[PDB]
Scaffold this active site. Structure first.
Site, short mmCIF file in Angstrom:
data_model
loop_
_atom_site.label_atom_id
_atom_site.label_comp_id
_atom_site.label_asym_id
_atom_site.label_seq_id
_atom_site.Cartn_x
_atom_site.Cartn_y
_atom_site.Cartn_z
CD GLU A 35 28.09 30.47 36.57
OE1 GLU A 35 28.19 31.71 36.75
OE2 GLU A 35 28.83 29.66 37.16
CG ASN A 46 33.99 38.24 38.92
OD1 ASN A 46 33.03 37.84 39.57
ND2 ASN A 46 34.24 37.84 37.70
CG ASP A 48 39.35 38.86 39.68
OD1 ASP A 48 38.30 39.40 39.26
OD2 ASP A 48 39.82 37.81 39.19
CB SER A 50 38.05 39.34 36.01
OG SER A 50 37.38 38.57 36.99
CG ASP A 52 32.25 35.93 35.74
OD1 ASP A 52 33.45 35.72 35.45
OD2 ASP A 52 31.78 35.66 36.86
CG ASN A 59 37.06 35.63 34.90
OD1 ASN A 59 38.27 35.81 34.82
ND2 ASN A 59 36.29 36.29 35.74
C1 LIG Z 1 33.60 29.90 33.65
C2 LIG Z 1 34.83 30.67 34.07
O1 LIG Z 1 35.36 31.47 33.30
N1 LIG Z 1 35.32 30.38 35.28
C3 LIG Z 1 36.49 31.07 35.80
C4 LIG Z 1 37.58 30.07 36.18
O2 LIG Z 1 38.09 29.46 35.00
C5 LIG Z 1 38.72 30.76 36.92
O3 LIG Z 1 39.58 29.77 37.49
C6 LIG Z 1 40.92 29.77 37.16
O4 LIG Z 1 41.03 29.21 35.83
C7 LIG Z 1 42.40 29.01 35.43
C8 LIG Z 1 42.41 28.63 33.96
O5 LIG Z 1 41.82 27.36 33.74
C9 LIG Z 1 43.04 27.97 36.34
O6 LIG Z 1 44.37 27.65 35.86
C10 LIG Z 1 44.56 26.34 35.43
O7 LIG Z 1 44.66 25.51 36.60
C11 LIG Z 1 44.80 24.11 36.28
C12 LIG Z 1 44.76 23.33 37.58
O8 LIG Z 1 43.42 23.14 38.02
C13 LIG Z 1 46.09 23.88 35.49
O9 LIG Z 1 46.18 22.52 35.11
C14 LIG Z 1 46.08 24.76 34.24
O10 LIG Z 1 47.30 24.61 33.54
C15 LIG Z 1 45.85 26.23 34.60
N2 LIG Z 1 45.74 26.99 33.36
C16 LIG Z 1 46.60 27.97 33.09
C17 LIG Z 1 46.43 28.68 31.77
O11 LIG Z 1 47.47 28.34 33.88
C18 LIG Z 1 43.08 28.54 37.76
O12 LIG Z 1 43.60 27.59 38.68
C19 LIG Z 1 41.66 28.89 38.19
N3 LIG Z 1 41.71 29.57 39.47
C20 LIG Z 1 40.90 29.21 40.46
C21 LIG Z 1 41.01 29.96 41.78
O13 LIG Z 1 40.05 28.33 40.33
C22 LIG Z 1 38.19 31.63 38.06
C23 LIG Z 1 39.27 32.44 38.78
O14 LIG Z 1 40.00 33.27 37.88
O15 LIG Z 1 37.22 32.55 37.55
C24 LIG Z 1 36.08 31.88 37.03
O16 LIG Z 1 35.15 32.84 36.67
#
Ligand SMILES: CC(=O)N[C@@H]1[C@@H](O)[C@H](O[C@@H]2O[C@H](CO)[C@@H](O[C@@H]3O[C@H](CO)[C@@H](O)[C@H](O)[C@H]3NC(C)=O)[C@H](O)[C@H]2NC(C)=O)[C@@H](CO)O[C@H]1O
Length: 129
Positions: A35, A46, A48, A50, A52, A59
């Site tokens: 990473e 990124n 979008d 955002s 990292d 993120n």
């Molecule tokens: C290391 C890093 O920061 N990675 C980033 C990822 O975390 C991010 O993914 C999105 O993260 C959110 C928050 O965890 C995900 O939402 C959660 O989804 C789960 C289901 O899997 C649910 O149970 C949770 O309640 C929900 N949390 C909230 C607060 O709503 C979201 O699904 C992830 N999206 C994807 C496409 O994976 C990604 C994308 O923003 O970026 C990484 O850098």
């Protein structure tokens, strides 16, 4: 700060990341390597809008606030700049929130694509831990 492999391993272990949520220390070192290349100052924009940050490339859309990310959530309640310190405490504590249930370490793209299912034990080879 650019950490050495064992140097980071010992620091992550000290902070309780070894076997955190069932993820061995090798998984965390491997994730950091791919990473950020062990560099606490690494930043990557990124598509979008955002960015990292740090050794674990956390993120700005969900975990930290960088002041320029639309829809930012700041779930770790810290400025993203705190994730770039030579001291990895903030990164570790935020990574613990990210990996806890959700999809665990799948949150890290480099982990999924280059660590998951691989020989991660090799990442702590030779380390006095
Ligand atoms: C290391 C890093 O920061 N990675 C980033 C990822 O975390 C991010 O993914 C999105 O993260 C959110 C928050 O965890 C995900 O939402 C959660 O989804 C789960 C289901 O899997 C649910 O149970 C949770 O309640 C929900 N949390 C909230 C607060 O709503 C979201 O699904 C992830 N999206 C994807 C496409 O994976 C990604 C994308 O923003 O970026 C990484 O850098």
């Amino acid at each position: 700060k650019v950490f050495g492999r064992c140097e980071l391993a010992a620091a992550m272990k000290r902070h309780g990341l070894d076997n955190y949520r069932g993820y061995s220390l090798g998984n965390w070192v491997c994730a950091a390597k791919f990473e950020s290349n062990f560099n606490t100052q690494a930043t990557n924009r990124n598509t979008d809008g955002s960015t990292d940050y740090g050794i674990l490339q956390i993120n700005s859309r969900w975990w930290c606030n960088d002041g320029r990310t639309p829809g930012s959530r700041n779930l770790c309640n810290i400025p993203c700049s705190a994730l770039l310190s030579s001291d990895i405490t903030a990164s570790v504590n935020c990574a613990k929130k990210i990996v806890s249930x959700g999809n665990g370490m799948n949150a890290w793209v480099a982990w999924r694509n280059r660590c998951k299912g691989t020989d991660v034990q090799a990442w702590i080879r030779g380390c006095r831990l």
